[PDB]
Design a protein around this ligand. Sequence first.
Ligand SMILES: CCCCNc1ccc2cccc(O)c2n1
Length: 134
Amino acid sequence: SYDTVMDKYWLSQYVIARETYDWYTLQKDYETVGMLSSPSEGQSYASQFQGDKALDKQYGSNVRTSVTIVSIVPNGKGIGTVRFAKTTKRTDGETTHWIATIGYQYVNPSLMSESARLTNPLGFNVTSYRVDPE
Ligand SMILES: CCCCNc1ccc2cccc(O)c2n1
């Protein structure tokens, strides 16, 4: 009940943050992914925005990828499944569907600063992340 709803919330929040490309919210989404990810999942995500072919450098404000959550199943054992679709346009675009398998946990929220808890009250933490076509 409380746990399932709360897991769905954070799993939802993470996917939206991770799979959205929007130049004007990129920094916030980026830092959100970071705060909610393990160091390894963080650097994996961050690699998209590194180098001469970084997404931001390659898309600027001329592209937007919106995310729509279709369903979420926390398998109760640290693995969550998120079915979602992505729409990309050039500033009705192509729409594709996806399945995100997410390893995640909650770390003791007391181990954060207060500021950190405003972003991550439960210590939600994504240990692994993979997204496959459907
Ligand atoms: C083609 C979708 C594959 C899913 N992988 C990712 C993973 C992180 C992302 C961050 C910003 C924009 C995207 O299209 C992203 N796509």
